[PDB]
């Protein structure tokens, strides 16, 4: 999930790409019907507000 | 009977050959066109009708002489006009 | 048009040599194809 970064290490680049694929795939240009998403966490503090 | 030259008769001629008045011949020929035995047009102001197609009839061995003769010199028109084609179009293809 | 065709084929001249490919490069191409056939 992550929040975002100001791009420190080289690993979280493509992981932010992986997350931004997910966010557009949730409700971007699609009838999101009959596909219900249930999530869970212990800390909802390190999350993207866009997520 | 009328040739392919004119075949354009008049309502006075229908009033002559059928002895029926002027105010009924149009009601006759609309019925002839509705049946479809004849196909042509009707002028009213010059009292003439442009008959084009007639119902084809039967004929004896005398009419095939005339259709024979009208076929005969129609042969040599195709001969004569194609003769210019092979003569003037000679060298264009061997 | 025909005069522009007939007054036109005199500058065809000095068309000296249409060499096909070569002789040395043709023998070298035959040698390279010989190496391709040996390989």
């Amino acid at each position: 999930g992550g929040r975002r970064f100001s791009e420190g290490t080289s690993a979280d680049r493509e992981i932010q790409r992986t997350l931004m694929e997910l966010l557009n795939q949730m409700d971007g240009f699609d009838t999101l019907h009959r596909v219900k998403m249930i999530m869970a966490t212990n800390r909802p503090d390190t999350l993207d507000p866009a997520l | 009977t009328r040739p392919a030259n004119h075949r354009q008769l008049t309502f006075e001629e229908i009033a002559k050959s059928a002895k029926i008045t002027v105010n009924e011949v149009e009601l006759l020929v609309m019925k002839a066109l509705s049946v479809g035995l004849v196909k042509g047009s009707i002028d009213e102001v010059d009292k003439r009708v442009h008959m084009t197609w007639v119902q084809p009839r039967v004929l004896d061995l005398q009419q095939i002489k005339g259709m024979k003769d009208r076929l005969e010199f129609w042969c040599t028109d195709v001969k004569s006009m194609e003769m210019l084609v092979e003569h003037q179009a000679h060298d264009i293809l061997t | 048009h025909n005069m522009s065709v007939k007054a036109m084929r005199f500058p065809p001249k000095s068309y000296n040599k249409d060499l096909e490919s070569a002789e040395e490069r043709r023998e070298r191409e035959q040698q390279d194809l010989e190496f391709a056939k040996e390989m």
Binding site: - | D77, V78, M81 | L33, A36, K37
Partner: protein, 154 residues
């Protein structure tokens, strides 16, 4: 096609070259490099062939493949022939404006640069004489075919 046949691999072990050429008739076609990769010779050989035909077959396939019926004795969509005769000329004007364009950069850089340089954009010269042939053949045929039927038909 190139019909082949086996050669003895025993003679290959003998190192003996087979087939003893007595006629300059087989070494006329050159074998491919791709079949030379394979065993065309080391294991098989080529044969020069031809085909057997006769006048019994030549005429009955020549006179029958592409033959019209009464097609050239027509008028070719008599309202749309002249419509097409503007549907080419209209852009032929602007292509003649490109012919009023491309001549004007002559006596300039040498025309071999005018050979490489014109591989992105169209030329007026070839495209121009194309439509002259198109408009010519579209017109003269319908012109003569229109005028024969006046003579033949009455």
């Amino acid at each position: 096609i190139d019909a082949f046949r086996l050669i003895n691999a025993n003679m290959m072990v003998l190192g003996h070259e087979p087939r003893q050429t007595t006629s300059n008739l087989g070494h006329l076609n050159k074998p491919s490099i791709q079949a030379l990769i394979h065993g065309l010779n080391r294991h098989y050989y080529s044969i020069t062939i031809n085909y057997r035909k006769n006048e019994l077959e030549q005429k009955m396939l020549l006179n029958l493949h592409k033959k019209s019926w009464m097609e050239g004795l027509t008028l070719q969509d008599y309202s749309e022939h002249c419509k097409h005769n503007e549907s080419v000329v209209k852009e032929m004007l602007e292509l003649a404006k490109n012919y009023n364009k491309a001549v004007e950069e002559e006596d300039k850089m040498t025309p071999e640069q005018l050979a490489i340089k014109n591989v992105g954009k169209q030329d007026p010269k070839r495209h121009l004489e194309e439509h002259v042939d198109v408009l010519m053949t579209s017109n003269i045929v319908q012109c003569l075919a229109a005028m024969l039927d006046t003579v033949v038909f009455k």
